[PDB]
Amino acid sequence: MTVEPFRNEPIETFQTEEARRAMREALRRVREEFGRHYPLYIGGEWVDTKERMVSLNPSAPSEVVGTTAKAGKAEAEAALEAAWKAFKTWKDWPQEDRSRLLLKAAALMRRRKRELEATLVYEVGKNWVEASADVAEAIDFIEYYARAALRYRYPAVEVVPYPGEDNESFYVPLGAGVVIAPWNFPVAIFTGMIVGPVAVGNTVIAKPAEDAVVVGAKVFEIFHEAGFPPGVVNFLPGVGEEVGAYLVEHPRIRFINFTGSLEVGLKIYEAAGRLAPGQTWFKRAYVETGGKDAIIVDETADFDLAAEGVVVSAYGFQGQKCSAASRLILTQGAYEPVLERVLKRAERLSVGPAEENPDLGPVVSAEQERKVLSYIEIGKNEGQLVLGGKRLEGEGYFIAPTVFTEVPPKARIAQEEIFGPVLSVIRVKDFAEALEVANDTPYGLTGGVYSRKREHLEWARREFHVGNLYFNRKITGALVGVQPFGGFKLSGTNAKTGALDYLRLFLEMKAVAERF
Amino acid sequence: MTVEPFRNEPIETFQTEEARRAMREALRRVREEFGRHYPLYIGGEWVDTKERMVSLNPSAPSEVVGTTAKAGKAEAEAALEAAWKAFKTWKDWPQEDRSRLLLKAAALMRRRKRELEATLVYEVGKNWVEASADVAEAIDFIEYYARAALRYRYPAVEVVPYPGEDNESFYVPLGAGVVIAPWNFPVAIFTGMIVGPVAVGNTVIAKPAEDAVVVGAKVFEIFHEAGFPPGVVNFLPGVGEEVGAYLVEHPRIRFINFTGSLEVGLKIYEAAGRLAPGQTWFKRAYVETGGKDAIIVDETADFDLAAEGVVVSAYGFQGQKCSAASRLILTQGAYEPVLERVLKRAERLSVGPAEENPDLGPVVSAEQERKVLSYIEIGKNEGQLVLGGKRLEGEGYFIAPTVFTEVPPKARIAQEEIFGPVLSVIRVKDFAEALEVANDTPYGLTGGVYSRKREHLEWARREFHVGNLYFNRKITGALVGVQPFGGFKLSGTNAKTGALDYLRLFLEMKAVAERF
Amino acid sequence: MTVEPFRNEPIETFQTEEARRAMREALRRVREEFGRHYPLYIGGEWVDTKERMVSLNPSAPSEVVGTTAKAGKAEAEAALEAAWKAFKTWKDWPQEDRSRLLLKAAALMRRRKRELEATLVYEVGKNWVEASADVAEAIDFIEYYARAALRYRYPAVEVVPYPGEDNESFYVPLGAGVVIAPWNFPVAIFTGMIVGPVAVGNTVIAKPAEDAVVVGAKVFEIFHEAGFPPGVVNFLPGVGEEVGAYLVEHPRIRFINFTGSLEVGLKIYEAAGRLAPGQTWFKRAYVETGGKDAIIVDETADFDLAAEGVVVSAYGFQGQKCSAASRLILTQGAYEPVLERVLKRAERLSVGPAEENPDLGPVVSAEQERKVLSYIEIGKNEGQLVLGGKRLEGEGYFIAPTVFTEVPPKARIAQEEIFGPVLSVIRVKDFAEALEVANDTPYGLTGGVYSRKREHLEWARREFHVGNLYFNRKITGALVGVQPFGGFKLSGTNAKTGALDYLRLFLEMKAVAERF
Numbered sequence A, B, C: 001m002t003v004e005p006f007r008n009e010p011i012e013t014f015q016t017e018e019a020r021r022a023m024r025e026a027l028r029r030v031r032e033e034f035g036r037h038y039p040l041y042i043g044g045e046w047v048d049t050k051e052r053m054v055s056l057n058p059s060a061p062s063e064v065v066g067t068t069a070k071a072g073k074a075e076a077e078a079a080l081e082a083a084w085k086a087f088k089t090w091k092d093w094p095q096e097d098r099s100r101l102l103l104k105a106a107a108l109m110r111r112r113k114r115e116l117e118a119t120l121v122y123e124v125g126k127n128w129v130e131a132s133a134d135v136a137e138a139i140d141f142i143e144y145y146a147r148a149a150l151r152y153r154y155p156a157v158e159v160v161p162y163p164g165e166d167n168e169s170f171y172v173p174l175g176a177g178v179v180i181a182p183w184n185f186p187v188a189i190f191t192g193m194i195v196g197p198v199a200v201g202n203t204v205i206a207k208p209a210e211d212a213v214v215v216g217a218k219v220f221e222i223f224h225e226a227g228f229p230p231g232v233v234n235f236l237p238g239v240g241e242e243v244g245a246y247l248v249e250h251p252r253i254r255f256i257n258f259t260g261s262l263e264v265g266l267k268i269y270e271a272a273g274r275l276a277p278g279q280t281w282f283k284r285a286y287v288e289t290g291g292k293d294a295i296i297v298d299e300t301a302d303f304d305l306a307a308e309g310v311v312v313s314a315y316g317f318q319g320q321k322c323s324a325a326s327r328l329i330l331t332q333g334a335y336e337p338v339l340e341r342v343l344k345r346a347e348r349l350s351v352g353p354a355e356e357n358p359d360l361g362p363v364v365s366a367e368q369e370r371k372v373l374s375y376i377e378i379g380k381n382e383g384q385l386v387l388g389g390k391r392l393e394g395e396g397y398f399i400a401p402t403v404f405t406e407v408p409p410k411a412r413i414a415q416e417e418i419f420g421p422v423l424s425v426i427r428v429k430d431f432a433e434a435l436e437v438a439n440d441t442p443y444g445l446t447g448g449v450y451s452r453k454r455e456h457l458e459w460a461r462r463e464f465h466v467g468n469l470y471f472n473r474k475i476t477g478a479l480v481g482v483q484p485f486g487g488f489k490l491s492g493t494n495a496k497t498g499a500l501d502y503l504r505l506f507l508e509m510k511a512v513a514e515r516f
């Protein structure tokens, strides 16, 4: 109640000369900075190592955007020591003080937004608007969680009174935990998963994805400048199956906040359920995994509106979003009209170096390129290729917008997360069958419906089993505070980010009674 | 808002002639029915089996108090089918309707409380007031959760609005899950763990502890008369390692609500973390395990008040409580004064057949008797036996209130949960050391402090790491609504029963946006 | 919100045998302790002095009820040092902790209420119910202020937000102050004036009235057992014009909380307005002084109800109340009917040793007896004596209920506070004149109206200028929380006791802005 009500950070469109000028200068400075080395951040200080992590420009992989130190078991141990030592006092900070620290960090991040956006363009291949949306979401997480944390301040629990006694229940943080983040939203998700737990008194050891270690380091430069006490937040870039797994299985790690693939999420959730030797608690593990998101369009929809939303949802950031539309379910009456419009729009999409602000930049790495191309080959034997399906010319990892149609609902390309610019179109009889097909996957993250029929929309509101459902609009771009984000089924544990409920996940409750 | 504000059900003291008469009548009715056989309850009907489970009177084990059917894998599968079929429609009931069903069940239970209390007396050896407290708590859970559930009704999530869109977030139940309960509070905990999830739309398969299958069956008679739709609640008495484990590991079990030993809780939490073949979700498992609870007394305390609270906390229901005081930590100035008073009070405690309302009835079974006696032998090699430590004459499992002094903090009897009438007394230098010793165990459920020094009480409020802390009063008997119940560390996952937060554990959130 | 909602402590009527037995027991215990000596209480310890103060039984002045130490300038300085040293840390206690300390004190006082009541009976001559009402009010102040204080907890001020900034306003306590109390409600007012300021973080030096030093000491025994940190509350019995004035004029006294005569209140308010040498603040002084309270009765009233309320209001505790009805204003139609009934009831009132629970005990001291008798002589020259007006037989200061009629509104006995069992009856033409006469005094504390005419009651609600107005009931006995107590004009500064606003008087506000 001491700051203005939360509002989302505007996403820059770069339509004004001022915006373009600022972005061009930011891109130039980041490019001129290629090759910089960023150390680990442990206990309030930057610590270098002998080994290193290399981050390449996916639009021109011969170019090294930057390098960072590489955390091994020894560095993980040092971070654990620092995080637990810091927790001892950080947990006792008044919530108002912790929240003000977050607000300071948000102000600092906002002042460096163009630089962060430019870093995303070069490090992970996002075009200009995708980069702006990423950083805007990161700022939103900080602003939102700073305010939400105050709702849990001492003593926040509603209890029933008892004669002759004071009964007080309140929340306390868990301790030191590990954050393991993805490369697709390396500023937003990385920031959110760290600051949420930290806001309410926990301390964190952050493990950025290998493909986005440089931007992760820049986020830590902001944390350092903001003044977080030594040990409260630690930066440990390194190999997931190495330092990441080491921390996940550690007896002294209190919680794990993970966002990534289902394959890894399953391993982490299983490991979290085990009592490591000497462990004295039941670990909490929050795992937000992938999705196989569908957009249903029936014959009553605005076909042009639907086609535009489908193209944005399927190809934004080259389809490398957990929320991306990878399935397009069309009822018989909508099939021809919508598919023709989708193909016409998709074939006009530009693909090229992210710095040029194309509709699509490159996929993030050589391995991701190999995987997407492999799925395209699988798709050719499952459905009918009607657009793209090839790597484009150039050193960058450029893949053309791809569309398969007449895809069987149980085909691999209609069930497995490809995480590339590949859309599978499924033809169904009616809306009931559309919902059946939409629900018949192991996932349940995002989904959409384009329809003018009220009964179909309200039917879907109840029966389309996804955590984030959107009607007559794109299914990507969930806004902090507006759309609590998180899925069902194998899309994760339903830890809703950008929602009041998120912080409760990093707190435990104590009930204290005094009989007078 | 359509019913009176929640109030705890009064615990009968039997100080009036009418109360005593009513209890004698209930005891007679219950024993006249010792020959009854109770089938399983699946899909709205009582279903019998070939094999059976026998329940004995711990105060006279040659006497059978009843028999029940025995659930195997086949019955577990039938219950699963019924629970999922029921979930399909139960999840769509208006919350007001589900809450009214709970209120009806509470009214029916209240009308049969003497019968239930008498059943507890004979089946698990609780004396009169312990039995009344158990049933009263069960009624409280139903009344509390019925009201708390309405706080989550559609659409309950606070979100940030966005121009030209309707953004609605709401909770939905998880599905069919399994409840695995303990024998020490076979009416209260059994009821709470079932009705909490059910209140918000989930369906449950309940597995009562082998030692309390008869009273569990009587609770289901109430659920049946209340009118829960077929499949919403199912009763599956059987062997824990058989039918219990089968359900815990099942790919179609959505959540597990468990209260019991740490040994079993660890196995359940580990199993829940695994993806069974064909499983399509990350299982939620709530495990509330044991405790090694201590009461600290310093030299400023009211020694007589402390001694009384210690004896009540250590020997109530023969120490068979997760909240029982099994450790007495005395600062040097409080040592002799408190120990002398505790011994004087403890030596006056009566032990005998539970129906005669002794201070202590028998422990629940031959197995428990064996375990407690074994720990007494271990204690003789670690500390100094100063009171009790013997089995008393009679077929019933009568064990005398026991006290060990000069016990090392790291001794087995000072670290492991004995779950019997055994108190370990530890001498410490000052309050700081008292807290260190109090916190140095793998558990963190309940704790208490007797002191008049404000600074010591507020210090403990912050540093005595237990989920339920009590000052200048007994540490057992947490009241629904007043004292959210649940621990830290190896005492469990901190699922606070009798609190608004409890129901959130059995819900997931959906966010639906419509762009107009 | 962690304790039951506030409720007033019931006032014992002694209608049961148990109540009477309990009182007789308390009276015996108290008189057996008449030889006790009570030291000063400074910095957490009882400190004795060379000189002493003697307290006599007003019902038998040759009997000493106790003696206390006598504080001089040296002791006042020691108390100041202790109070300021304590303030340094007491001000930083979480409000929840300070409030719990008050609740503990209330619980301790409640357990010793018969003892305190008996002490009031013997030390200040209150009959049984007057004594019980006094102690009950004291308990009420503690319970009420403990809860009210939480309404001001950090950060409690509602402010307007500003872009890019955190703006936080909150309350902080003032420091060390002095409480100077009266002898008529030596438990209730003494307690309230101390615990209100203390609850929100201030420290206090309490100066009890000379005539009630023993009961004041017993209240401090409770504060000591409750555990207030050393220096937070200090007990300095002594001479008002000596130690009281010394503290009032001291440059290091932050505030003065006074309840007493107008004569003394005027001197205190004037002194508080001066900057003593070296003083670094503007002193706050709250002075609640006397009153010349009237009850108006018009011809539409229930004359029997009015007569009863008038007698209770005029003669309760021998008229030694700031709220006592000392003026009876009767319109012409109500004059004879009401006067006749008042005289009939008043003539039946018993007067004698307070312990025998008479309608009236003795006035508090030889000095008060002298003052009241002097006013009676003055009255004989201004009005017509129609009842009482004489000293009754016995060493005790027994004065008969007195009534003067045909008293001119401007007469000394109709303007000056007599503080004895003396009622002045004034005849007026109509209600308008009744209000004019009621308002024409330098005071404005309590007032009452007996009437059935709605228009007269609502007229008085707006025009009878007194801080506490009562319709168709006694004008004494304001209940904490129900009737904020405090007057207008020369009745004081309108510091409403037993109201949320009271605590604000002992706080200052700080506004802190951070530009991010």
Ligand SMILES: NC(=O)c1ccc[n+]([C@@H]2O[C@H](COP(=O)([O-])OP(=O)(O)OC[C@H]3O[C@@H](n4cnc5c(N)ncnc54)[C@H](O)[C@@H]3O)[C@@H](O)[C@H]2O)c1
Binding pocket: A180, A181, A182, A183, A184, A185, A189, A207, A208, A209, A210, A238, A239, A240, A241, A242, A244, A245, A248, A259, A260, A261, A262, A264, A265, A267, A268, A288, A289, A290, A291, A321, A322, A323, A417, A419, A445, A486, A487, A491, A492
């Ligand atoms: N649910 C969501 O909110 C959400 C959001 C964004 C991305 N995602 C998902 O993330 C995936 C893309 O991200 P990615 O390619 O970085 O995922 P990934 O699972 O391959 O790696 C995620 C993180 O885990 C680390 N890691 C890898 N193996 C590990 C192991 N054995 N133990 C511990 N840590 C290990 C990595 O180094 C990285 O930090 C896609 O499946 C996408 O749908 C989900």
Ligand SMILES: NC(=O)c1ccc[n+]([C@@H]2O[C@H](COP(=O)([O-])OP(=O)(O)OC[C@H]3O[C@@H](n4cnc5c(N)ncnc54)[C@H](O)[C@@H]3O)[C@@H](O)[C@H]2O)c1
Binding pocket: B180, B181, B182, B183, B184, B185, B189, B207, B208, B209, B210, B238, B239, B240, B241, B242, B244, B245, B248, B259, B260, B261, B262, B264, B265, B267, B268, B288, B289, B290, B291, B321, B322, B323, B417, B419, B445, B486, B487, B491, B492
């Ligand atoms: N934390 C709490 O709120 C709380 C409350 C009451 C009791 N308890 C604890 O419960 C224990 C006493 O109860 P108990 O003796 O019934 O405990 P237990 O762990 O032996 O059995 C608990 C339940 O689990 C079942 N079970 C046993 N083995 C199983 C397996 N492998 N898989 C699945 N289910 C299995 C049993 O049949 C029973 O229904 C003590 O440790 C006590 O502290 C805890």
Ligand SMILES: NC(=O)c1ccc[n+]([C@@H]2O[C@H](COP(=O)([O-])OP(=O)(O)OC[C@H]3O[C@@H](n4cnc5c(N)ncnc54)[C@H](O)[C@@H]3O)[C@@H](O)[C@H]2O)c1
Binding pocket: C180, C181, C182, C183, C184, C185, C189, C207, C208, C209, C210, C238, C239, C240, C241, C242, C244, C245, C248, C259, C260, C261, C262, C264, C265, C267, C268, C288, C289, C290, C291, C321, C322, C323, C417, C419, C445, C486, C487, C491, C492
């Ligand atoms: N307004 C109210 O709420 C309220 C309540 C009760 C009593 N009173 C008034 O209190 C008076 C009766 O009490 P009392 O006889 O104790 O009053 P008083 O004014 O004679 O004395 C009050 C207190 O002030 C001290 N004192 C005396 N002279 C002093 C000085 N020069 N400097 C500092 N302190 C000094 C006394 O020792 C005592 O502690 C009556 O006027 C009555 O109406 C008012």
Ligand SMILES: [Cl-]
Binding pocket: A462, A463, A464, A465, A466, B172, B510
């Ligand atoms: Cl759903």
Ligand SMILES: [Cl-]
Binding pocket: A172, A510, B462, B463, B464, B465, B466
């Ligand atoms: Cl804690």
Ligand SMILES: [Cl-]
Binding pocket: C462, C463, C464, C465, C466
């Ligand atoms: Cl007025």
